[PDB]
């Protein structure tokens, strides 16, 4: 069943952020997959990151920042995760965390 | 043989021309290293232990146009740290042996007075 | 017809007691005997000395090639091969201006000069060490080359025995060595070229770095045990001589131990390179009571080598001292007669390891040769032999031929295959230099650390 | 049963980090197959059969290889016959290769990367190795000290003519 | 030798992985080209729901 | 041996000599690099020596 909290973010800085933040949720018991911490060295990442936003993910968190925004591979992660929302008909699933101190509200994607 | 004085030993080395067009046993001993001429020179000192043998070393003298030494000694030794690089194994052996050779008097010797 | 026995190559521990022949192979394949858990360096330069330091770094970071990678063993990286972290973001830098180098080099006297270039770096080192709380395993010290050529009562020497009070590891790099590509002499090419041998370079810097900083690259374990391999060396003061002792031996975990053994010995005397009966006595006691503290028991052995032969009353005065149950054994080691083996057919020099025996009491062994193992023989020329002379006791002259190429393989300054001389003599000659290019020390040191 | 990890790359550049990986994962006790360590026939049994992992040693050099591209085409044929999707690895070393010129059949996949030192992909390698519990003997130094000899420390002997 | 790369999309040429090899190369000859108007896809399949196709 | 010298300087000093000179030998002669050196102190050398 889908009970697997998906996290987006920037590869090579949003790392520090991520992985304090999915430790911090595997230790509360949350099950958590992050595209570093989780995928499998040699697997066809789209094949099961698509698959996975689709059928695992039960919460979808993105970690807002001034380039995760505007990195081109997490905008996909962003736009399947907009279709299934739509299907699992539930307005709270995509929770877009704002970390970096220059974003503020006003350059994120309408998304 | 022309003499070169060393340190705290003898060296010993041809005048160019003395051997057959400046070679023997078909083994170059005197040649030209750019505008300098180098001469194989070996230095001997005979010991009696462990046997009594005639301990010989190489060298290598340089000297302008084949006729007086350098008298300079840094010039000398840069010279010869350079030309040595060419040298081999089997270019010292046979450098040697053929200079040593030339001593001979009979033929599977030489004595000396 | 002259017959040369061979003495076979002996085998150093690594990781996990596992054996090899090569440190440049044995590490890269193995990992070091002990493992330490990171290298905080310290850096003491200009701007374009820690640019170049940290730069440096990060290309040690990723494998190393060199041209001729067959004929010696590439660099894979320093954490592949140690297996600790070595970071070049984590340096305490402590910045060193030109101008004030300037203004030590202008002052009219040579020695004051020197002095005041060691009293630079070596206060900045001392007040970072007693100030910065961030721990700082080895000082790295780029100087430029304005030191190694206008200082010329040497920089080194004197810079490393002025912070043996202290006990301050520390590693000078000359920017020459770090910067070669952008040092040329003026011909577009670098002044020393380092392009086919930069994996080698590499390695040898890594294992000093390595070795400073508490990690053990390697150790032997192909030396009999219960012996005391005591080592010897005299040094000029103008006419005073001055003895500096190293020795190696086996612990009761069959683990080597290699440490300095320096007390001050100064002789003055007419008859140069030899010692009074009481320094002597004192040289010795101060080894058995490091052995007895090591191990618990004394020696059954004391094999004292030096680069000169020992006279009556020295030996009587060892004696004395000596304990019952324990032979001393003096060996000479001489590298001046010129036993020069040409092979009949071919190109490549006799092989290393060749022994030729003169009689019981002597030996000639090629502690240089062509080694297969690296395909690279140690000599560009031919390799003059050492001349391993048992002075005085009682011993098998194949046994110390065994034993003295044993002793030729644990440099730890430089990862070559091996030391052309024995180890223990080399490093107490590094001492001697080091010892007596300052002021007397009441205890120095006895870790090499501080010295190579 | 296939409980080896075969370990391709170009044969006259790409030696010295195969022999490397190779005996660095013999000495931790798996069973690696590498040309250099051990014609075309026997290559494609091991992947048809013995192979268990293949890891690509992917290089500006390793991709233009025709005979290499050839041990992926049977790789990526027998990944699918085993239904596992975690059977080609793409080790990336070079320095210059940046994931816009791999070739097609390994695009796909996620490299473990190589690229900044070895020492760290080498433990991403056994990360994944573990994830996918790739079963392996007790490193003992015994039998992997054969093969050790056989590469490098039986190369020490030292000829015996006179 | 592509200049565009036109997708015939259906219910089953997104299943199909070799079509998804070449996506995943045309996606990165995207980025060398900067071509954002490069793989222009093309659905036929009403079955399709024209919002269940790959991230990318 | 320490303990019993009847003067309380000399008994305070040399416990501190035998403590810090094991320290200071094995920071010069040990090739280890010790980060933290910790004295464990037994609980006669606290109040007997006071
Ligand atoms: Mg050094």
């Not at chain 2, 690089?85 to 040593?100: E, G, M, S």
């Amino acid at each position: 069943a889908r009970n697997k909290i998906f996290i987006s973010h920037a590869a090579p800085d949003d790392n520090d952020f991520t992985k304090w933040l999915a430790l911090k949720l595997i230790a509360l018991g949350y099950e958590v997959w992050c595209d570093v911490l989780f995928l499998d060295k040699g697997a066809d990442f789209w094949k099961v990151i698509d698959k996975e936003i689709r059928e695992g993910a039960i919460k979808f968190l993105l970690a807002t920042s001034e380039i995760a925004i505007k990195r081109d591979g997490v905008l996909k992660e962003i736009a399947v995760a907009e279709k299934v929302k739509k299907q699992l008909k539930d307005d709270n699933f995509i929770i877009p965390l704002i970390i970096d101190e220059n974003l503020s509200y006003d350059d994120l994607p309408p998304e | 043989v022309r003499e070169y004085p060393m340190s705290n030993k003898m060296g010993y080395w041809f005048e160019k021309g003395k051997l057959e067009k400046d070679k023997f046993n078909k083994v170059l001993l005197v040649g030209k290293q750019k505008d300098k001429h180098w001469h194989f020179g070996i230095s001997a000192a005979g010991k009696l232990y462990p046997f009594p043998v005639l301990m010989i070393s190489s060298h290598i003298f340089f000297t302008k146009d084949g006729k007086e030494l350098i008298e300079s000694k840094k010039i000398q030794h840069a010279a010869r740290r350079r030309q040595g690089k060419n040298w081999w194994n089997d270019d010292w052996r046979n450098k040697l042996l053929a200079f040593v050779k030339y001593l001979s008097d009979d033929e599977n010797s030489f004595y000396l007075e | 017809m002259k017959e040369l026995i061979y003495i076979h190559e002996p085998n150093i521990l690594f990781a996990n007691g596992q054996k090899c022949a090569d440190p440049r192979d044995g590490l890269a394949l193995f990992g070091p005997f002990t493992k330490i858990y990171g290298i905080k360096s310290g850096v003491v330069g200009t701007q374009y000395g820690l640019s170049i330091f940290k730069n440096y770094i990060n290309h040690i970071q990723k494998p190393i090639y060199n041209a001729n990678n067959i004929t010696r063993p590439m660099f894979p990286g320093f954490e592949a091969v140690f297996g600790c972290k070595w970071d070049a973001d984590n340096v305490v830098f402590k910045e060193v201006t030109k101008e004030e180098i300037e203004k030590i080099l202008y002052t009219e006297s040579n020695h004051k000069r020197t002095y005041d270039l060691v009293s630079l770096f070596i206060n900045k080192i001392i007040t970072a060490n007693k100030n910065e709380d961030e721990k700082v395993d080895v000082w790295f010290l780029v100087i430029p080359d304005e030191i190694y050529q206008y200082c010329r009562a040497q920089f080194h020497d004197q810079l490393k025995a002025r912070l043996l009070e202290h006990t301050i590891p520390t590693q000078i790099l000359r920017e020459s060595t770090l910067a070669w590509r952008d040092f040329k002499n003026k011909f577009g090419a670098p002044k020393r070229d380092f392009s086919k041998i930069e994996g080698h370079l590499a390695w040898t810097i890594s294992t000093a770095a390595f070795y400073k900083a508490g990690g053990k690259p390697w150790k032997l374990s192909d030396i009999r045990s219960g012996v005391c391999y005591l080592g010897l060396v005299y040094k000029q003061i103008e006419p005073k001589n001055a003895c500096c002792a190293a020795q190696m031996f086996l612990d009761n975990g069959d683990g080597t131990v290699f440490k300095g053994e320096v007390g001050p010995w100064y002789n003055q005397e007419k008859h140069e390179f030899h010692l009074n009966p009481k320094e002597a006595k004192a040289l010795l006691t101060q080894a058995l009571n490091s052995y007895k503290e090591q191990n618990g028991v004394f020696p059954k052995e004391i094999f004292i080598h030096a680069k000169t032969k020992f006279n009556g009353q020295e030996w009587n005065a060892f004696q004395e001292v000596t304990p019952e149950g324990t032979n001393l054994v003096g060996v000479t080691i001489t590298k001046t007669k010129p036993l020069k083996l040409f092979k009949s057919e071919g190109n490549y020099p006799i092989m290393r390891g060749n022994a030729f025996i003169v009689n019981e009491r002597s030996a000639f062994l090629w502690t240089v040769g062509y080694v297969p193992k690296t395909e690279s023989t140690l000599s560009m020329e031919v390799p003059n032999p050492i001349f391993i002379e048992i002075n005085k006791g009682e011993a098998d002259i194949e046994q110390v031929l065994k034993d003295v190429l044993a002793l030729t393989k644990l440099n730890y300054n430089a990862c070559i295959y091996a030391d052309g001389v024995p180890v223990t003599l080399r490093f107490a000659d590094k001492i001697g230099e080091i010892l007596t290019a300052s002021t007397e020390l009441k205890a120095p040191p006895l870790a090499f650390k501080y010295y190579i | 049963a296939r409980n080896k990890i075969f370990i391709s790359h170009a044969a006259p550049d790409d030696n010295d980090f195969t022999k490397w990986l190779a005996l660095k994962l013999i000495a931790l006790g798996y069973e690696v197959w590498c040309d250099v360590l051990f014609f075309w026939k026997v290559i494609d049994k091991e992947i048809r059969e013995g192979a268990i992992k293949f890891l690509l040693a992917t290089s500006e050099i390793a991709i233009k290889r025709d005979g290499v591209l050839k041990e992926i085409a049977v790789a990526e044929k027998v990944k699918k016959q085993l239904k596992d999707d975690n059977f080609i690895i793409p080790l990336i070393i070079d320095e210059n290769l940046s994931y816009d010129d791999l070739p097609p059949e390994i695009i796909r996949l996620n490299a473990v990367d190589f690229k900044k030192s070895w020492a760290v992909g080498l433990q991403d390698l056994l990360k994944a190795l573990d994830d996918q519990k790739v079963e392996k003997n007790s490193p003992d130094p015994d039998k992997s000290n054969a093969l050790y000899q056989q590469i490098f420390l039986h190369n020490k002997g030292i000829i015996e003519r006179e």
